[PDB]
Amino acid sequence: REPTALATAAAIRSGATTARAETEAAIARIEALDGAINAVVVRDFDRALAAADAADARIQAGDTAPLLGVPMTVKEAFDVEGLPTHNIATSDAEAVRRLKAAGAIILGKTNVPGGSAAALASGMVPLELGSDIGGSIRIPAHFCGVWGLKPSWGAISSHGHRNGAETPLGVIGPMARSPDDLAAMLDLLATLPMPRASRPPRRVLAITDHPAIRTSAVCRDAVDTAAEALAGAGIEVIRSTDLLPDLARQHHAYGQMLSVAFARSDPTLHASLPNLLTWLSWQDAQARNTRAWGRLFGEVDAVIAPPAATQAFTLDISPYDAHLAWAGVATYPGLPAVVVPVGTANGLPVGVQVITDFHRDHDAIATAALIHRLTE
Amino acid sequence: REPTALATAAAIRSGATTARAETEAAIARIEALDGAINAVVVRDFDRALAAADAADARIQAGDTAPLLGVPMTVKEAFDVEGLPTHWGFRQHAGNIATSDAEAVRRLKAAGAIILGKTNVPKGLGDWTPGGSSGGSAAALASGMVPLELGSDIGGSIRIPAHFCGVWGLKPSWGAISSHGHRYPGTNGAETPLGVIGPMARSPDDLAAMLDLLATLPMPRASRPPRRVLAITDHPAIRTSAVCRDAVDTAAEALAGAGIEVIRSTDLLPDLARQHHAYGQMLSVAFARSDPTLHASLPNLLTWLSWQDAQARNTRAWGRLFGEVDAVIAPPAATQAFLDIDGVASPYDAHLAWAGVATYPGLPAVVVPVGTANGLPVGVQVITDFHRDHDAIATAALIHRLTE
């Protein structure tokens, strides 16, 4: 039941603890627990302790930065100066730069999924930083019972996260065990200030079935539980609308675009890339999809849905993207989506994803928080 | 000249005039110039007066949205609800915009009155300088209206502003939504280059417009600049003496106010390579226009590689902006006197000065700095990505100092 990031920060500021203590304790927890959970695959414990010392000095000098002294890890795909990335990074990723400027201590990097989600769930650290490579923020968060924000496309710079430009599906985003933690991370990471949460939602679309994959009853029931809780608080919940984009076609288009990213990654598959004119048509359809979602969001304030179809589930040197169907609902149009834990079933976490309109990230967090409070 | 937009808005707020009066006056000024300047090619005067009435009601109800009652026009490329956008229908009603472009929506919400739409700027060799040829810039320069709204992929904000002696912001890439705007002849690949932006006769006007138009809040102006790079030569084209001298005038004014002006730096990205890469991207954006461009389309891997190089370019500019606060340069190679902002080829040298800021996505303000040979001449002020407000402030400083 370890404290939140904001709680740790305020405790360091108030003199109830120090950055050094928090870093020492987190190292101990990792060494204790990572024995059995191999999450922290790149350790930077000595430099971290020295940085904790630096942060303590800052605190004593009266500095008031919102994550000062808070230990954390980040996905191994982020450059951290002097650590390896799949090759030694000569500079920090932009997101890492911003986290350090806010005072956080990077203890090391977690293995690609859910490393980050495991580190959070096991209590090792209160903050983490993932990236949406096929639902790699939301699905681990759902599997492991923690919180994740897959932000609006382009909200946060992915410079230093792995030859340079932003990709039309990929985003980086915060993971935590608290919505207030997510919100503070978003405000630190965002290139430009994101709109503040508006009024509580008045109407929500709840969906439980996706044409591309069968969803388990547990995941469906979780959405239903959330829907009923919202209804009970006087929010109107609908289950169908003419403004819902065609999810089958959307999922097909998502898989096409996703396969480009992975075809480009290996020269042997370079022959199978589409031609430029096809690519430009795919980008136009993506843009249209975003606008279609915008129209839906003229009628509803949020969409609630499964994060994934299930709960948590060689001599050779994936084509199958239907497990990503639920992730692609938000990813393809670039909409923000928060995964929130809503309980355990069969001794395993289950969450719900809350999708809002483009740039309504803060609302996704607030509505997720509302669901959590109403579901206890 | 006529008052600025912010001056008009304060006069309406103070009760010195009304939106109705301002709209009546602007209509009269447009009609007065029908002989010589036909820039307002789509007119919506009746609905405008009713919208002026609405704005007056808002004022009476205590609203203080910053453009309330201020008349304006917008480039004909923008959708305005109830006015023609050519949608390809072989009937009238099919070609009527059913909604405002996002930028127009924002302007109207802030209280501006859209009287109508201005002709797209005329091309190089088709040219108040030029009469109507400047479109938005001509409407501003002639005093018809104090606010305008343009779009710029190869200079159609900056260069008309320079030709006509008015102000324009080519914002940071992505700063303002281009929903409801269409670059004729493009195929989606113009998206990494094109921006929409405000035009006015005042830096304060530009700054207020930017804040109303911006999707997300833009950083506030920081301290005054301490160091500026002045450049007068581009490898792809010869620049006229007068355009060079304008930069020199601005440089000397800044220097005289104690700002350090340099003329060279190791951190200046390679303008020749950048100009070539800009032309390549334009040749894809406009490939629908021409069988030759269609034939010479690259493969996808090459396209994606061009986008990576563009991203690297932006960062190279960022490194330059760790040492200087602004770059001042010609807006264009001359003064006044398939279609890519007035030119017929993606590789036309006349785009050189436009490309300096366009390719990396940097903000650039064009500011009038006087007249030579009886024609306006301006300077473009380029700042780092998202430092739009600094571009405007530095432009404003230049203007004050060259009085």
Coordinates of all heavy atoms in Angstrom, one line a residue, chain A residues 153 163-168 260 264 276 279-280 283 286, chain B residues 173 187-193 273 277-278 280-282 284-285 298-315 359-361:
Chain A
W153 N -2.6 12.2 -29.1 CA -1.5 12.2 -30.0 C -0.8 13.5 -30.1 O -1.5 14.5 -30.2 CB -1.9 11.7 -31.4 CG -0.7 11.5 -32.3 CD1 0.2 10.4 -32.4 CD2 -0.1 12.5 -33.1 NE1 1.2 10.7 -33.3 CE2 1.1 12.0 -33.7 CE3 -0.4 13.9 -33.4 CZ2 1.9 12.7 -34.6 CZ3 0.4 14.6 -34.3 CH2 1.5 14.0 -34.9
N163 N 14.1 7.2 -37.2 CA 15.4 7.9 -36.8 C 15.0 9.3 -36.6 O 15.7 10.2 -37.1 CB 16.4 7.7 -37.9 CG 17.8 8.1 -37.5 OD1 18.1 8.1 -36.3 ND2 18.6 8.6 -38.4
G164 N 13.9 9.6 -35.9 CA 13.6 11.0 -35.5 C 12.2 11.6 -35.5 O 12.0 12.3 -34.5
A165 N 11.4 11.3 -36.5 CA 10.0 12.0 -36.5 C 9.0 11.3 -35.5 O 9.3 10.1 -35.1 CB 9.5 12.1 -37.9
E166 N 7.9 12.0 -35.2 CA 6.8 11.3 -34.4 C 6.1 10.4 -35.4 O 6.0 10.6 -36.6 CB 5.8 12.3 -33.8 CG 6.5 13.3 -32.9 CD 6.4 13.0 -31.4 OE1 5.7 12.0 -31.1 OE2 7.2 13.6 -30.6
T167 N 5.6 9.3 -34.8 CA 4.9 8.3 -35.6 C 3.4 8.4 -35.4 O 3.0 9.0 -34.4 CB 5.4 6.9 -35.2 OG1 5.2 6.0 -36.2 CG2 4.9 6.4 -33.8
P168 N 2.5 8.1 -36.4 CA 1.1 8.5 -36.3 C 0.3 7.8 -35.3 O -0.9 8.2 -35.1 CB 0.6 8.3 -37.7 CG 1.6 7.3 -38.3 CD 2.9 7.5 -37.7
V260 N 3.1 -1.1 -40.9 CA 4.1 -0.2 -41.5 C 5.3 0.0 -40.5 O 6.4 -0.1 -40.9 CB 3.6 1.1 -42.1 CG1 4.7 2.1 -42.4 CG2 2.7 0.8 -43.3
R264 N 9.0 -1.4 -41.4 CA 10.0 -0.4 -41.6 C 11.2 -0.7 -40.7 O 12.4 -0.4 -41.0 CB 9.5 1.0 -41.3 CG 10.6 2.1 -41.5 CD 10.1 3.5 -41.5 NE 11.2 4.4 -41.7 CZ 11.3 5.6 -41.1 NH1 10.3 6.1 -40.4 NH2 12.3 6.4 -41.4
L276 N 3.6 5.1 -51.7 CA 3.4 6.4 -51.0 C 1.9 6.8 -51.2 O 1.3 7.3 -50.2 CB 4.3 7.4 -51.6 CG 4.2 8.8 -51.1 CD1 4.3 8.9 -49.5 CD2 5.3 9.7 -51.6
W279 N -0.1 5.1 -48.7 CA 0.1 5.7 -47.4 C -0.6 7.0 -47.2 O -1.2 7.2 -46.2 CB 1.7 5.9 -47.2 CG 2.0 6.5 -45.9 CD1 2.5 7.7 -45.7 CD2 2.0 5.9 -44.6 NE1 2.8 8.0 -44.3 CE2 2.4 6.8 -43.6 CE3 1.6 4.6 -44.1 CZ2 2.5 6.6 -42.3 CZ3 1.6 4.3 -42.8 CH2 2.1 5.3 -41.8
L280 N -0.6 7.9 -48.2 CA -1.2 9.2 -48.1 C -2.8 9.0 -48.0 O -3.4 9.7 -47.2 CB -0.9 10.1 -49.3 CG 0.6 10.6 -49.3 CD1 0.7 11.5 -50.5 CD2 1.0 11.4 -48.0
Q283 N -3.4 8.1 -44.3 CA -3.3 9.2 -43.4 C -4.6 10.1 -43.5 O -5.1 10.5 -42.5 CB -2.1 10.0 -43.7 CG -0.8 9.3 -43.3 CD 0.4 10.2 -43.5 OE1 0.6 10.7 -44.6 NE2 1.1 10.4 -42.4
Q286 N -7.3 8.3 -41.5 CA -7.1 8.5 -40.1 C -7.6 9.8 -39.6 O -8.3 9.9 -38.7 CB -5.6 8.3 -39.8 CG -5.2 8.4 -38.3 CD -3.7 8.4 -38.0 OE1 -2.9 8.8 -38.8 NE2 -3.4 7.9 -36.8
Chain B
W173 N 4.4 25.6 -36.9 CA 3.7 24.5 -37.4 C 2.8 23.9 -36.3 O 3.2 23.7 -35.2 CB 4.6 23.4 -38.0 CG 3.9 22.2 -38.5 CD1 3.4 22.1 -39.8 CD2 3.5 21.0 -37.8 NE1 2.8 20.9 -39.9 CE2 2.8 20.3 -38.8 CE3 3.6 20.6 -36.5 CZ2 2.2 19.0 -38.4 CZ3 3.0 19.4 -36.2 CH2 2.4 18.6 -37.1
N187 N -2.6 16.9 -51.7 CA -3.0 15.6 -51.5 C -2.8 15.0 -50.1 O -2.8 13.8 -49.9 CB -2.2 14.7 -52.5 CG -0.7 14.7 -52.2 OD1 -0.2 15.3 -51.2 ND2 0.1 14.2 -53.2
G188 N -2.7 15.9 -49.1 CA -2.4 15.5 -47.7 C -0.9 15.7 -47.3 O -0.6 15.9 -46.2
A189 N 0.0 15.6 -48.3 CA 1.4 15.7 -48.0 C 1.9 17.2 -47.8 O 3.1 17.4 -47.6 CB 2.2 15.0 -49.1
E190 N 1.0 18.1 -47.9 CA 1.3 19.5 -47.6 C 1.2 19.8 -46.1 O 1.7 20.8 -45.6 CB 0.2 20.5 -48.2 CG -1.1 20.6 -47.5 CD -2.1 19.5 -47.7 OE1 -1.8 18.5 -48.4 OE2 -3.2 19.6 -47.1
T191 N 0.7 18.8 -45.4 CA 0.4 18.9 -43.9 C 1.7 19.2 -43.1 O 1.6 19.9 -42.1 CB -0.2 17.5 -43.5 OG1 -1.6 17.7 -43.9 CG2 -0.2 17.2 -42.1
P192 N 2.9 18.6 -43.4 CA 4.1 19.0 -42.7 C 4.6 20.4 -42.9 O 5.6 20.8 -42.2 CB 5.1 18.0 -43.1 CG 4.3 16.9 -43.8 CD 3.1 17.6 -44.4
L193 N 4.0 21.2 -43.8 CA 4.6 22.5 -44.2 C 3.6 23.7 -43.9 O 4.0 24.7 -43.4 CB 5.0 22.5 -45.7 CG 6.1 21.5 -46.1 CD1 6.3 21.4 -47.6 CD2 7.4 21.8 -45.3
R273 N 20.7 22.9 -48.5 CA 20.2 21.6 -48.3 C 18.8 21.7 -47.9 O 17.9 20.9 -48.4 CB 21.1 20.8 -47.4 CG 20.6 19.5 -46.9 CD 21.4 19.1 -45.6 NE 20.9 17.8 -45.0 CZ 21.3 17.4 -43.8 NH1 22.0 18.1 -43.0 NH2 20.9 16.2 -43.3
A277 N 15.4 20.2 -49.7 CA 14.5 19.3 -49.0 C 13.1 19.8 -49.0 O 12.1 19.1 -49.2 CB 15.0 19.0 -47.6
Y278 N 13.0 21.2 -48.8 CA 11.7 21.8 -48.9 C 11.0 21.6 -50.3 O 9.8 21.2 -50.3 CB 11.9 23.3 -48.7 CG 10.8 24.3 -48.8 CD1 9.5 24.0 -48.2 CD2 10.9 25.5 -49.4 CE1 8.5 25.0 -48.3 CE2 9.9 26.5 -49.5 CZ 8.7 26.2 -48.9 OH 7.8 27.2 -49.0
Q280 N 11.6 19.2 -52.4 CA 11.3 17.8 -52.5 C 9.9 17.6 -51.9 O 9.0 17.0 -52.5 CB 12.3 16.9 -51.8 CG 13.6 16.8 -52.5 CD 14.6 16.0 -51.7 OE1 14.6 16.1 -50.4 NE2 15.3 15.1 -52.3
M281 N 9.7 18.1 -50.7 CA 8.4 17.8 -50.0 C 7.3 18.5 -50.8 O 6.2 17.9 -50.9 CB 8.5 18.3 -48.5 CG 9.3 17.3 -47.7 SD 9.3 17.8 -45.9 CE 7.6 17.5 -45.6
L282 N 7.5 19.7 -51.2 CA 6.5 20.4 -52.1 C 6.2 19.6 -53.3 O 5.0 19.7 -53.8 CB 6.9 21.8 -52.5 CG 7.0 22.9 -51.4 CD1 7.6 24.2 -51.9 CD2 5.6 23.2 -50.8
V284 N 5.9 16.5 -53.7 CA 5.0 15.5 -53.3 C 3.6 16.1 -53.0 O 2.6 15.6 -53.5 CB 5.5 14.6 -52.1 CG1 4.5 13.6 -51.7 CG2 6.8 13.9 -52.5
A285 N 3.6 17.1 -52.2 CA 2.3 17.8 -51.8 C 1.5 18.2 -53.0 O 0.3 18.1 -52.9 CB 2.7 19.1 -51.0
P298 N 8.4 9.8 -54.9 CA 9.3 8.8 -54.3 C 8.5 7.6 -53.7 O 7.3 7.6 -53.7 CB 9.9 9.7 -53.2 CG 8.8 10.6 -52.7 CD 8.1 10.9 -54.0
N299 N 9.3 6.6 -53.2 CA 8.7 5.5 -52.5 C 8.5 6.0 -51.1 O 8.9 7.0 -50.6 CB 9.5 4.3 -52.7 CG 10.9 4.3 -52.1 OD1 11.2 5.1 -51.1 ND2 11.8 3.4 -52.5
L300 N 7.8 5.1 -50.3 CA 7.4 5.4 -49.0 C 8.6 5.6 -48.1 O 8.6 6.5 -47.3 CB 6.4 4.3 -48.4 CG 6.0 4.5 -47.0 CD1 5.3 5.9 -46.8 CD2 5.1 3.4 -46.6
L301 N 9.5 4.7 -48.2 CA 10.7 4.7 -47.3 C 11.4 6.1 -47.5 O 11.9 6.6 -46.5 CB 11.7 3.6 -47.6 CG 11.5 2.3 -46.9 CD1 12.6 1.3 -47.3 CD2 11.4 2.4 -45.4
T302 N 11.6 6.5 -48.7 CA 12.2 7.8 -49.0 C 11.3 9.0 -48.3 O 11.9 9.8 -47.7 CB 12.3 8.0 -50.5 OG1 13.1 7.0 -51.0 CG2 12.9 9.4 -50.9
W303 N 10.0 8.9 -48.5 CA 9.1 9.9 -47.9 C 9.4 10.0 -46.4 O 9.6 11.0 -45.8 CB 7.7 9.6 -48.2 CG 6.7 10.5 -47.6 CD1 5.8 10.2 -46.6 CD2 6.5 12.0 -47.9 NE1 5.1 11.3 -46.3 CE2 5.5 12.4 -47.0 CE3 7.1 12.9 -48.7 CZ2 5.1 13.7 -47.0 CZ3 6.7 14.2 -48.7 CH2 5.7 14.6 -47.9
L304 N 9.4 8.8 -45.7 CA 9.5 8.7 -44.3 C 10.9 9.3 -43.9 O 11.0 9.9 -42.8 CB 9.3 7.3 -43.8 CG 7.8 6.9 -43.9 CD1 7.7 5.4 -43.4 CD2 6.9 7.8 -43.1
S305 N 11.9 9.0 -44.7 CA 13.2 9.5 -44.5 C 13.3 11.0 -44.6 O 13.9 11.7 -43.8 CB 14.2 8.8 -45.4 OG 15.5 9.4 -45.3
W306 N 12.5 11.6 -45.5 CA 12.4 13.1 -45.6 C 11.8 13.7 -44.4 O 12.2 14.8 -44.0 CB 11.6 13.5 -46.9 CG 12.4 13.2 -48.2 CD1 13.6 12.7 -48.3 CD2 11.8 13.3 -49.5 NE1 13.9 12.5 -49.6 CE2 12.8 12.9 -50.4 CE3 10.6 13.8 -50.0 CZ2 12.7 12.9 -51.8 CZ3 10.4 13.8 -51.4 CH2 11.4 13.4 -52.2
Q307 N 10.8 13.0 -43.8 CA 10.2 13.5 -42.6 C 11.1 13.4 -41.4 O 11.1 14.3 -40.5 CB 8.9 12.7 -42.4 CG 7.8 13.1 -43.5 CD 6.5 12.5 -43.2 OE1 6.4 11.2 -43.1 NE2 5.5 13.3 -43.0
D308 N 11.9 12.4 -41.3 CA 12.9 12.3 -40.3 C 14.0 13.5 -40.4 O 14.4 14.0 -39.5 CB 13.7 11.0 -40.3 CG 12.8 9.8 -39.9 OD1 11.8 10.0 -39.2 OD2 13.1 8.7 -40.3
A309 N 14.4 13.8 -41.7 CA 15.3 14.8 -41.9 C 14.7 16.2 -41.5 O 15.4 17.0 -41.0 CB 15.9 14.9 -43.3
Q310 N 13.4 16.4 -41.7 CA 12.7 17.6 -41.3 C 12.8 17.7 -39.8 O 13.1 18.8 -39.3 CB 11.3 17.6 -41.9 CG 10.5 18.9 -41.6 CD 9.1 18.8 -41.9 OE1 8.5 17.7 -41.8 NE2 8.5 19.8 -42.4
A311 N 12.4 16.7 -39.1 CA 12.5 16.7 -37.6 C 13.9 17.0 -37.1 O 14.1 17.8 -36.2 CB 12.1 15.3 -37.1
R312 N 15.0 16.5 -37.8 CA 16.3 16.8 -37.4 C 16.6 18.3 -37.6 O 17.3 18.9 -36.8 CB 17.3 15.9 -38.1 CG 17.3 14.5 -37.7 CD 18.6 13.7 -38.1 NE 18.7 13.5 -39.6 CZ 18.0 12.6 -40.2 NH1 17.3 11.7 -39.6 NH2 17.9 12.6 -41.5
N313 N 16.1 18.8 -38.8 CA 16.3 20.2 -39.1 C 15.7 21.1 -38.0 O 16.4 22.1 -37.6 CB 15.7 20.5 -40.5 CG 16.0 21.9 -41.0 OD1 15.1 22.8 -40.8 ND2 17.1 22.2 -41.6
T314 N 14.5 20.8 -37.6 CA 13.9 21.6 -36.5 C 14.8 21.7 -35.3 O 15.0 22.7 -34.7 CB 12.5 21.0 -36.2 OG1 11.7 21.1 -37.4 CG2 11.8 21.8 -35.1
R315 N 15.4 20.5 -34.9 CA 16.3 20.5 -33.8 C 17.5 21.3 -34.0 O 18.1 21.9 -33.1 CB 16.5 19.0 -33.3 CG 15.2 18.4 -32.8 CD 15.4 17.0 -32.2 NE 15.9 16.1 -33.2 CZ 15.3 15.1 -33.8 NH1 14.0 14.9 -33.7 NH2 16.0 14.2 -34.6
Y359 N 10.1 25.0 -43.6 CA 10.5 23.6 -43.6 C 10.7 23.2 -42.1 O 10.1 22.1 -41.8 CB 11.8 23.5 -44.4 CG 12.4 22.1 -44.4 CD1 12.0 21.1 -45.2 CD2 13.5 21.8 -43.5 CE1 12.5 19.8 -45.2 CE2 14.1 20.5 -43.5 CZ 13.6 19.5 -44.3 OH 14.2 18.3 -44.3
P360 N 11.4 23.9 -41.2 CA 11.5 23.4 -39.8 C 10.2 23.7 -39.0 O 10.1 23.1 -37.8 CB 12.7 24.2 -39.3 CG 12.7 25.5 -40.1 CD 12.3 25.0 -41.5
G361 N 9.3 24.5 -39.5 CA 8.0 24.7 -38.8 C 8.2 25.9 -37.8 O 7.4 26.0 -36.9

